[PDB]
Design a protein around this ligand. Structure first.
Ligand SMILES: CC(C)CCC[C@@H](C)[C@H]1CC[C@H]2[C@@H]3CC=C4C[C@@H](O)CC[C@]4(C)[C@H]3CC[C@]12C
Ligand SMILES: CC(C)CCC[C@@H](C)[C@H]1CC[C@H]2[C@@H]3CC=C4C[C@@H](O)CC[C@]4(C)[C@H]3CC[C@]12C
Ligand SMILES: CC(C)CCC[C@@H](C)[C@H]1CC[C@H]2[C@@H]3CC=C4C[C@@H](O)CC[C@]4(C)[C@H]3CC[C@]12C
Ligand SMILES: CC(C)CCC[C@@H](C)[C@H]1CC[C@H]2[C@@H]3CC=C4C[C@@H](O)CC[C@]4(C)[C@H]3CC[C@]12C
Ligand SMILES: CCCCCCCCCCCC
Ligand SMILES: CCCCCCCCCCCC
Ligand SMILES: CCCCCCCCCC
Ligand SMILES: CCCCCCCCCC
Ligand SMILES: CCCCCCCC
Ligand SMILES: CCCCCCCC
Lengths: 524, 524
């Protein structure tokens, strides 16, 4: 279940946004420096404590327990916008049940008269747009001029959003497993369809330029600090780390269990599939580039939904457009639904034991399931509006990416490396997994991750570039302040809990900090 | 370790030889009818008996125990020629240690003056040959006019053959594990390089025609019975079934072990990698087809070594030819060496307990290791000669493929389905794997496999077409008789043992057959 939408949507969009292969160098650097390190860190914390996200930190250190609450805020904010991605896929699937796909040609009402089939884009107001972009913006999104103009709500997406929310609600309400029936179909189908797209994508006449764009890096983009943050957060996003799910996932694992092999295996496949999937989508872009006579960096739309622009273009070029289009949206929806079933249930599982005596399992719990879904439905309803795409971009860049992931990832390593000690963790690890691992992990949590986290944070601050959508829309100042509020909401959690914890322990600050620094029953 | 030279070399050659996608329909039919069925059959026999190839049949049925000896003959004959494939790869690797690859251009001594670089083939004695083919036939094989002309021995291959034989001898002699050190590098590297070739192969300008050739079938070829036999034996070859290795492999498995999941998983990946690998090599052929202005069915050489013609052509188009060429031959040699380490040690392990009191572990055993390797070295030395390629084709088509695999596969199912009973096996299976499986297996061993095995055998006999090499060389009558002798050697083992055992049990034939039909201590 390592495959998610991030690997097929977030990764391609981020890599496309950040030049070409210039994304890869920070991507693999962050992978081998922190990603697998912090992934194993959370997994082994879960195994050592056999406890949940917030509470395992309490076991490791009563102070700096705000990391757990920060994770809850991130997962909550993530679910609010992650579901809207599934809403688009569901709408596309519904539109893929018609004989001729709507985006195959642009002669319908919503298409701007300046549209022209990609086949004639080069064959024949110099700026000519494509049907695939038109359907996504003038039909699926009804893009408004700006975030300051919300406009009329699009009920089509709202209904699709309600459906996916209801599917998620019932699955959690009825304790339905994340993978339905046999896990194989839920597993091999994403691989099969991805390989179907890859074979089609590579075979495309323009795939050569796309792969060269995909792999050959640009050192100039490395100077811009945004690529380092995005690559670092990409890994943080795809592995679903710093959200408390992996700590819960490691909880179920037995004390005597070789989680090291699982983490490095599941870690490399999750990134490996993303890298392979990057070949397919970027191969499409090269084909679109030469067919349209437009540069690869400008042939697609640099906003979330690159998976909704290049991949539906491939299914159009597939032997049976309708057949393949339906299957793609099925696997796309499948990769998102299973993620939601696990990540949504994580916070309620985190919330139910967070505030007991009121959320007892049963009547109190069942209404809470709808309560979480409904409030998050109204909040997720904002992205449905015509200008809700821009709000979505703020949620993607800030709520569960950007500085927020770096800050929490830093404190996860900062606590374990110094307050708890990387050497002290190995003593449990060799007891648990049976053998003491090498020095790659210890020198990553203590040095590589803290250096990478702060350096990206600091260089971001001095070289501050405001967030832009489609590299052409400048956000208003208030929206950036609103966007930072989501990030500040999660990051402020750690310091806030520290102050509360210190107050609880009346006494000299030094005595109080030392008292609560002591780990409390780390393992049983 | 499911990947072998069968998936990277045997499948491409067979598919290429038997038209295009017309190979696939019998391929998947035989897969789902017998391949996974007989694979699980041998695995579950090994698990139920926890005993070796010959002896497990004795447990199931003292009569029809010749299946074990037939497997020994097949594995022995297979090892004699399988090693010569590694000898070619080793020679290619040695030739890949030079700055410029020898087959990149044809201006050397061995190249016929009628050769012309593929780049100039279409750009410019109408039949013009290519350097890649020239290097393989002239420098690597020194192809003689016919099998009736052996000619001078090529010492280069003989030395390479001795080296791989010595590597195999020492690994078995020192009990070295099949996978050296960490299994990961022995495992992920074949996948990585295969995916490197696939990305390069698909990106090639002519990959479109090759995939269409690969997938779109021809019903006319289905009439020819040779495609059904080759597809059936391809599955039998790639899974290394009907050789007694899987029976030994299933022996190590615990009685309470879900081998069903392992078999269907390892079964589908082994065929899945072969199918994916077929895309890469056939993509190359389409690129060679359009660059040479020659049909895909005639652009390569229809003899064993298609992996030595298309794949080295691919690395000549990769960014670092020498770098990738060395890596390819490394993974090619890796896919063969590990197979030899396991399949060679299988027969000595089968021979040592077959004739005890003389092959005791130690001084008697160690000289036997060289004795098996040396005799098989002299026998494998025949394919090294200039005309030894044709002898190799006889070994490929007859010794461990063709009718020989069908006959033994038939009797494996014929014994279990009728003499032992498919229902009786399930009673153990539900006790072992914990749950009774479906009716797909039982109706395959009793109906699908026996119908497929005999039907291919019968239609082969009535529509007899003599074996040909490169679709242009007609073998002499004596060579076919020699070739059938290898096949008749293995198949005749079954009836021979039956007569010997019937003699052992003096009495009425009906009483004797019934007495030895009774299973003897099937499980402990
Ligand atoms: C899945 C992992 C192993 C990555 C896939 C392969 C990696 C190693 C990359 C590195 C360099 C790459 C090559 C670099 C340049 C080109 C030229 C282009 O016109 C076709 C693709 C091709 C030939 C690339 C194929 C893939 C490649 C070999
Ligand atoms: C909307 C923006 C401002 C985000 C606001 C986040 C609020 C709702 C969150 C973030 C940090 C949270 C606090 C952090 C720590 C604790 C200590 C615990 O023992 C009781 C709850 C308490 C006191 C939390 C209450 C709720 C809280 C204040
Ligand atoms: C690995 C398994 C799933 C097989 C790989 C994909 C299978 C399902 C096959 C079946 C039909 C195939 C397509 C049939 C025809 C063509 C046209 C050709 O010009 C490019 C490849 C393309 C577009 C094929 C891509 C691969 C394909 C989709
Ligand atoms: C070179 C060609 C003709 C192949 C010859 C194969 C010979 C060497 C093999 C094939 C079948 C074998 C026989 C089959 C069965 C048994 C019964 C066993 O209890 C003693 C060995 C004995 C009697 C085998 C002796 C060797 C044998 C005759
Ligand atoms: C000028 C009006 C702009 C309205 C923007 C609404 C943004 C909603 C954000 C919701 C965050 C939870
Ligand atoms: C006319 C001479 C032809 C010689 C052919 C030799 C074939 C050797 C076969 C070895 C089988 C074990
Ligand atoms: C081109 C005809 C397509 C008809 C609908 C197919 C739906 C398949 C769902 C698995
Ligand atoms: C010989 C010059 C090209 C580099 C070859 C490197 C081969 C590495 C094999 C592991
Ligand atoms: C300028 C502020 C407009 C409304 C912002 C609402 C944020 C939840
Ligand atoms: C016509 C027979 C030539 C020699 C055959 C040798 C077979 C081992």
């Amino acid at each position: 279940g390592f495959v998610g939408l991030g690997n097929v949507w977030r990764f391609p969009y981020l890599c496309y946004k950040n030049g070409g292969g210039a994304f890869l160098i920070p991507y693999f650097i962050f992978l081998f420096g922190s990603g697998l390190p912090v992934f194993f860190l959370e997994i082994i914390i879960g195994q050592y404590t056999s406890e949940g996200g917030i509470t395992c930190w309490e076991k490791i250190c009563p102070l700096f327990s705000g990391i757990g609450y920060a994770s809850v805020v991130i997962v909550s904010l993530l679910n609010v916008y992650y579901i809207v991605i599934l809403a688009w896929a569901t709408y596309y699937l519904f539109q893929s049940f018609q004989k001729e796909l709507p985006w195959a040609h642009c002669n319908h009402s919503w298409n701007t008269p300046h549209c022209m089939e990609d086949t004639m884009r080069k064959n024949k107001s110099t700026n000519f747009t494509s049907p695939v972009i038109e359907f996504w913006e003038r039909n699926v999104l009804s893009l408004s001029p700006g975030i300051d103009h919300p406009g009329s709500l699009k009920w089509d997406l709202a209904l699709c959003l309600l459906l996916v929310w209801l599917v998620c609600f019932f699955c959690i309400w009825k304790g339905v497993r994340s993978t339905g029936k046999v896990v194989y179909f839920t597993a091999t189908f994403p691989f099969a369809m991805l390989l179907v797209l890859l074979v089609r994508g590579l075979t495309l006449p323009g795939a050569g330029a796309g792969i060269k764009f995909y792999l050959y890096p640009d050192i100039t983009r490395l100077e811009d600090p945004q690529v380092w943050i995005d690559a670092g957060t990409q890994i943080f996003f795809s592995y679903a780390i710093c959200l408390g799910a992996m700590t819960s996932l490691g909880s179920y694992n037995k004390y005597k269990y070789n989680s090291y092999r699982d983490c490095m295996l599941l870690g490399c496949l999750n990134s490996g599939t993303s890298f392979v999937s990057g070949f397919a989508i970027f191969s499409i872009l090269g084909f679109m580039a030469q067919e349209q006579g437009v540069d690869i960096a400008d042939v697609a739309e640099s906003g979330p939904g690159l998976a909704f622009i290049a991949y539906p273009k491939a299914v159009t070029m597939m032997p049976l457009p309708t057949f393949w289009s339906i299957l793609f949206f099925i696997m796309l929806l499948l990769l998102g639904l299973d993620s939601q079933f696990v990540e949504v249930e994580g916070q309620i599982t985190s919330l139910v034991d967070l505030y007991p005596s009121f959320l007892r399992k049963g009547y109190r719990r069942e209404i809470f399931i709808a309560f979480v879904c409904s409030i998050s439905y109204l909040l997720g309803l904002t992205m449905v509006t015509e200008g809700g795409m821009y709000v979505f971009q703020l949620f993607d860049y800030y709520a569960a990416s950007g500085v927020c992931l770096l800050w929490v990832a830093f404190f996860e390593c900062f606590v374990i490396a110094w307050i708890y000690g990387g050497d002290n963790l190995y003593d449990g690890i060799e007891d648990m997994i049976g053998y003491r691992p090498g020095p790659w992990m210890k020198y990553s949590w203590a040095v590589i991750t803290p250096v990478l986290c702060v350096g990206c944070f600091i260089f971001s601050l001095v070289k501050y570039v405001p967030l832009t959508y489609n590299k052409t829309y400048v956000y208003p100042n208030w929206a950036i302040g609103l966007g930072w509020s989501l990030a500040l909401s999660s990051m402020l959690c750690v310091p806030l809990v520290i102050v509360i914890r210190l107050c609880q322990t009346e006494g000299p600050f030094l005595v109080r900090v030392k008292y609560l620094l002591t780990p409390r029953e780390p393992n049983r």
